[PDB]
Amino acid sequence: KSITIKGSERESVGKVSTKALRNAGAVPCVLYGGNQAVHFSADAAAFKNLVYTPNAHTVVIELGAGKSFNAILQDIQVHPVTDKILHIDFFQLFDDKEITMEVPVKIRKLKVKALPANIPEFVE
Amino acid sequence: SLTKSERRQRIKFRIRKTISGSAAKPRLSVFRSNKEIYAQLIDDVNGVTILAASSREKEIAKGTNVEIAAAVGKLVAEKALKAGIDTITFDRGGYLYHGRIKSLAEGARAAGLKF
Amino acid sequence: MKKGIHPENYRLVAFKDMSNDDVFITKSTAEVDGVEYPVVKMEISRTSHPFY
Amino acid sequence: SKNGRESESKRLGVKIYGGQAAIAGNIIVRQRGSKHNPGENVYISKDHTLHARVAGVVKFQKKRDNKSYVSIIPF
Amino acid sequence: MLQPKRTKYRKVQKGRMKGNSQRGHELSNGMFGIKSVHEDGMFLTSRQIEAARIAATRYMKREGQLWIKIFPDKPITKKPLEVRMGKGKGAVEYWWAVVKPGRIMFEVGGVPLSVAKEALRLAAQKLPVKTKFVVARDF
Amino acid sequence: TPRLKEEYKSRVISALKEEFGYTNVMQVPKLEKIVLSRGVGAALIDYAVDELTKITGQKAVITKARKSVAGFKIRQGYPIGCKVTLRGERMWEFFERLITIAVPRIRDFRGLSAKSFDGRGNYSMGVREQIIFPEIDYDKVDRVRGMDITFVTTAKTDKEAKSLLAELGLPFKK
RNA sequence: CGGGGGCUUCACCGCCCACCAAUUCCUGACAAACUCCGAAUGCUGUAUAAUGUUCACUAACAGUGAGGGCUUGGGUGCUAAG
RNA sequence: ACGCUUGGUAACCGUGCGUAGAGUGCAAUGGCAUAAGGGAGCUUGACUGAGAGACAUACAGGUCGAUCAGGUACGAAAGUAG
RNA sequence: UAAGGUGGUUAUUGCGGCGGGGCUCACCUCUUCCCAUCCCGAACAGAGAAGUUAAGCCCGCUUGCGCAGAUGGUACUGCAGUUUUGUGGGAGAGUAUGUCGUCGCCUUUC
C-alpha cells in the first residue's frame, strides 16, 4: 500500500520557528536520501494513518511547488509525557537502492531488504 | 615486533627520540642490507637532505664488507667536508654499533667531520 | 656453539645391531673400539621388527 | 563514625595557557603523571611538572591519539 | 523482593531527580503498559513493586507475562527513632528505583485489551504515582 | 655430514614437490626445531638437566616459573623446567638417532599418535623415558620422567604437514 | 558445553528423560567515589569600545572574627522543620 | 585456544589470538609498551660550591627548576646521572 | 615510470581477503675470523652469491572488521518574569553517508 502527504517547505529553521510551528498544530519533518536533506512541515493530520497503523506503507511527499518524493518512514520522535509526535525523518527512494524495511509477519516484524518496487506487504 | 623489521623500527624510534639535527650538525643515517650499504645526511628540522653516499659508484674497490664500509665512510666524510659541515650526530638506524657500522664511523672519524 | 659448556664426548659411534648385522655410524655420547670407533651393541635397530 | 579524615589539596591545574607568554623558567602545567607531554622548548621535571626552556608563546596542539604536547614558539 | 545480590558501596547519596525521563518511555516486547504522568520524580520501593506484580499476576491467572521495566537499584537509609540529628548516615532501610515522568513500569503481552486494561488498573492502585494506560502504535 | 639432512635435500624436496601441487622450490615445508622439554614436580632434584645434556650433546636451561598458584605451592621462580632446544645439524643428528633407535623400543610400540598435531603444523609427542636412549646406563639414574618433544616445522596446514614426517623414519600408526 | 536427580542392569559402564545451569548472540535499561563522548556558564591572555582612581604600593590608626532571611547547586535529616 | 609422561587446562614447553584487562614493595588517583614494567655489562651523581625563574602562599614553612666552575660513572659519540 | 632510504599529517592513514612484480629490497648457503645465546648462528655479527618471488616489501580491487560522520529534531543551559514562557548557546545517542590515504627531500632508473 501507499499513502500521500502534502507538506509545506520550511522557510526558517531554528528554535523560534519550531516553537511557532508547534503552537499551530504542525509537525516539522525532514527527508533525506537524495541530493540534499529537505525540511518540510505536516499538519499533524496526514499521520495517524501511517504511524498508528500495524502495516507497512510508503509515503508520497508532495510539497506543491516541488514534486513526488517517494519516501519511506524511517525515524519518529515522541514526547515522553504526552505521546505527541515531535519529529519525523523520511528516506527517499528513486529507482533501486536495495532498501531495508520492517515487514510484519502474517500467520513481530522481520527485517527485509528488497528493491523499492519488490517489497512484500506481509510474509508467510 | 619480532619480524626483523619491526625490531629495527623499535630501535630506530628509541634512537630518534634523542638524536636529531639542524642545518648545522645534521644527522647521519645508515642503512645496511645484504649488500651495498648506504649512508645519508638528513636535516630533520627543515626537511631537505644534504648529501648521500653509497657503495655504488666509480670509487669503491671490491672486497670485504668491513673495508667497503670504511671506504664509504671516508667518501662521505670527504664529500661532506666541502660545503663547510664540520659536526654531525651519528645515529645507527637500528643497527648495533659493531662491524660495518663501526667501520663506517671510524672511516669518517679518521677524516674530519668532528663527532 | 659456545666452547666450554657442551659435552666434548659427542663423537662418532657405531650402532651395530645384533639381529641383522646392520651398522649405523651416528654421533652420540654413548664400550670399546669395534672397527675404527666405539660401538654400542643393542637388540633392535631400525630394521629389526615388523611395523618398520 | 570512621570517616573524618582528608588531606590538603595540592593546588594542581593548568598554569599559563596556550596563548600567553612565558619565560625561561615558568611552570606551565602541574600534574600527577605526564598527561600533558613536553614538546619543543618545553621539558618535564621529576614531579611531572612542565617547565619552559626559552621565552615564547605556549601552544598545546593536542594530537597523536588525543595526547597533549605542550610546546613553546620562541619570540 | 527485588534487590541487587551485591554492590560496591552500601550507602548512596540522595540526589535530585529532574523529570521528563528521555529513555524508557517506549513499549517493547509488549503492547499494553502503564506509564507515569506525574509531575516530579518518585521512589518506587520493592514492597510496592512486589505488591503490584502479585496483584497483576492474580488477575489473568496463567495468560501472558508481566514485564517489569524497572529495578530497585538504590539503597535508602533511615536512622532509628529517638536519636538526635547527626552521628553519620543510618543503616540501609530499603531499596528503591527512581521513576521520572514518562517512564513505563509494567507491560503485558499475552492477554487481550479487555483483560490487560483491568489487570494494569488493578496493579496501578499499589503505586504512589499517577499512571496512564498506554497502548503500542503498531497494534 | 649427517645422513638425514642429505637424504632430505636429495629426495624429500622432489617428493613434496609433486603429490601436493607445489610450484616454487621455496614452498615445500621444512623442519625448524625439535625442542624437547620436561616438567619437574619438585617445588635439589635438577638431575633432569644432566639427563637431557646426555642424549643431545647440548646444554639445557632451567626456565624459572612465572605463575605463583598456591595450589601446588609453586612460589613462582622455581626450577621446574628443562626446555632444551635443537635447531641445527645437532637437531638433525638427534632426530636421526631418535627415529632409528630408541623410538622402536617402547613396550608394545604400535607407532605414534597420528592425531597429535596442533593444527598449525607442529607435532608434539610425549615419551615415557625408558632405558631406550643409548646414552644413559640405567645405573645412577632415579628413573627420570619422560619428555614432551616438539617438532616445529614450516608447514601451514596439518594436511601439508605429516608428509615430511611420513617421508622419514617416524611411523604414524598406519 | 558439563555437573545434581528418576527407571535398565555384574559395570557413578553403554543408555533414555525434567530443573538449577559455563561461553556466545539479540533486546530493555542503572551508578557521587563508571566514562568511548560531552555542553551553557565560569576562568585566563591580547586588542578594541564605554567610565575615570574606583586599581596597585608605603606609613599610622581601628573595628570585626556569635550572623540571619530569600533564589539557585548540593550533603545530612523523613526531597520534614523559621 | 589448540597439542604433550607425570600434569589435573590452574605448574613447564610449542604454535596462534591478544594495546594493556599485567606489573610498577606497601592505600587510592593520575601516568607508563617508541615504557616509568623485565634482563645483562660496567659503576656509585644517593658529588662539592650553588640556585636564572616560577607554583603555593597570615607567618613559620613547602614544591619544581635552567645555566657556570672542580673532579667523576656509563657510552664509540652525542648525551644522561646533584 | 618503478624501486630503496628518511620525515610531516590525531587509523577517512589501521586489520583482513583476492591477483601481479623484482638492476636496488628480501629470503637463501656457511660459522675460520669480529660478535652472542642464563641451551641453541633461532636472534645479533661476519664471510658469499647455487637459487627464488614462496614469504617479508610494493602495487590494483574489496564495505568485509575497524575509523570518521552530517542536516533536522531533542536533552541541557546563561539572562528576564513566572503555572504558563521570551530571547541566545546547543549536546550525546541514532540515521543517510565517507574511507583500502595524503604531502616533502635524496640515490639508481624511463
UniProtKB/TrEMBL annotation, chain A:
GO terms for molecular function: 5S rRNA binding; structural constituent of ribosome. GO terms for cellular component: cytosolic large ribosomal subunit. The keyword rRNA-binding applies. One of its GO terms (biological process) is translation. Residues 5-90 form the Large ribosomal subunit protein bL25 L25 domain. It comes from the Bacteria. The keyword DNA-binding does not apply. Keywords: Ribonucleoprotein, Ribosomal protein, RNA-binding, rRNA-binding. This is one of the proteins that binds to the 5S RNA in the ribosome where it forms part of the central protuberance. Part of the 50S ribosomal subunit; part of the 5S rRNA/L5/L18/L25 subcomplex. Contacts the 5S rRNA. Binds to the 5S rRNA independently of L5 and L18. Belongs to the bacterial ribosomal protein bL25 family. CTC subfamily. This is Large ribosomal subunit protein bL25. It comes from Flavobacterium johnsoniae (Cytophaga johnsonae). The chain holds residues 2 to 142 of 203 of the full protein.
Automatic annotation (TrEMBL), chain B:
The keyword Ribosomal protein applies. GO terms for cellular component: cytosolic large ribosomal subunit. Keywords: Ribonucleoprotein, Ribosomal protein, RNA-binding, rRNA-binding. The keyword Cell membrane does not apply. SUPFAM superfamilies: Translational machinery components (SSF53137). GO terms for molecular function: 5S rRNA binding; structural constituent of ribosome. HAMAP family: Ribosomal_uL18_B. NCBIfam families: L18_bact (TIGR00060). This is Large ribosomal subunit protein uL18. It comes from Flavobacterium johnsoniae.
UniProtKB/TrEMBL annotation, chain C:
GO terms for biological process: translation. Keywords: Ribonucleoprotein, Ribosomal protein. GO terms for cellular component: ribonucleoprotein complex; ribosome. GO terms for molecular function: structural constituent of ribosome. Coiled coil: none annotated. It comes from the Bacteria. Belongs to the bacterial ribosomal protein bL31 family. Type B subfamily. Part of the 50S ribosomal subunit. This is 50S ribosomal protein L31. It comes from Flavobacterium johnsoniae (Cytophaga johnsonae).
Automatic annotation (TrEMBL), chain E:
Keywords: Ribonucleoprotein, Ribosomal protein, RNA-binding, rRNA-binding, tRNA-binding. SUPFAM superfamilies: Ribosomal protein L16p/L10e. Gene3D superfamilies: Ribosomal protein L10e/L16. GO terms for biological process: translation. The keyword tRNA-binding applies. GO terms for cellular component: cytosolic large ribosomal subunit. One of its GO terms (molecular function) is tRNA binding. Residues 1-29 are annotated as: Disordered. Residues 1-17 have a biased composition (Basic residues). It comes from the Bacteria. Binds 23S rRNA and is also seen to make contacts with the A and possibly P site tRNAs. HAMAP family: Ribosomal_uL16. Part of the 50S ribosomal subunit. Belongs to the universal ribosomal protein uL16 family. This is Large ribosomal subunit protein uL16. It comes from Flavobacterium johnsoniae (Cytophaga johnsonae). The lineage of its organism: Bacteria, Pseudomonadati, Bacteroidota, Flavobacteriia, Flavobacteriales. The gene is rplP.
